[PDB]
Amino acid sequence: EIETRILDLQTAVEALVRSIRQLKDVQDVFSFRYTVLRQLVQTTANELDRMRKEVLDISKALVGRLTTLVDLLLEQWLTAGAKVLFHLRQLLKQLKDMSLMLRMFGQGVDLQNAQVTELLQRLLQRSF
């Protein structure tokens, strides 16, 4: 299912990117709800945790798609899956950077990146 895998990974990543940028913003107005020092602040924090949770869920499913990719796996698929792990480690790194404001969401970013670095060295040792 060699090239259908490249299709699903790229398009799912597009969805992740869209959901993540949408997410960044919902935070930014939460963070503009800062310097409030109320209902908006609470309902946005409420919408805050919603979006973050759903993004984490989708990335965890993509992390499962990554393990599917690795158990199924030549150089052009090695480089292509490298792109997936690379921007996946990038997007959740950014998520952590935001989660560090932390009104949970960050450790979920952690455990996902823990699977990421596990998969990364696991592939690097054989691809070398």
Partner 1 sequence: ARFATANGAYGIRPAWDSAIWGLLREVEAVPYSNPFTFPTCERLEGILNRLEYRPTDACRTLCRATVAVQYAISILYGYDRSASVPRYLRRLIDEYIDLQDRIRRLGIVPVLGKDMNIVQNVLPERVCAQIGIPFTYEACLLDEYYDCIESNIEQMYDLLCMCKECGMRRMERFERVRYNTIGERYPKKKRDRERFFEENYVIIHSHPDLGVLKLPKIRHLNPLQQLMMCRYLSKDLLYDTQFGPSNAFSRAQGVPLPFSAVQETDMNIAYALYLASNSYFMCFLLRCVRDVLRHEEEAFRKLILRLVNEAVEIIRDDVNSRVWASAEERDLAIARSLEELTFSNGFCRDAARFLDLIDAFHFPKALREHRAREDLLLHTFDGAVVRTGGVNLTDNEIVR
Question: What is the CB neighbour count within 10 angstroms for residue 66?
Answer: 21
Question: What is the CB neighbour count within 10 angstroms for residue 120?
Answer: 17
CB-based contact 15:58 (threshold 8 Å) = yes
If DSSP codes are grouped into helix, strand and coil, which group holds residue 32?
coil
CB-based contact 41:33 (threshold 8 Å) = yes
Residue 91 Cβ vs partner 1, minimum distance, rounded to whole Å = 15
30 versus 115: smaller Cβ distance to partner 1: 30
CB-based contact 96:111 (threshold 8 Å) = no
Residue 103 Cβ vs partner 1, minimum distance, rounded to whole Å = 11
48 versus 116: smaller Cβ distance to partner 1: 48
Residue 90 Cβ vs partner 1, minimum distance, rounded to whole Å = 15
32 versus 72: smaller Cβ distance to partner 1: 32
Summarize as ranges the residues that interact with partner 1 (CB under 8 A): 22, 25-26, 28-29, 31-36, 40, 47, 97, 100-101
Residue 40 Cβ vs partner 1, minimum distance, rounded to whole Å = 6
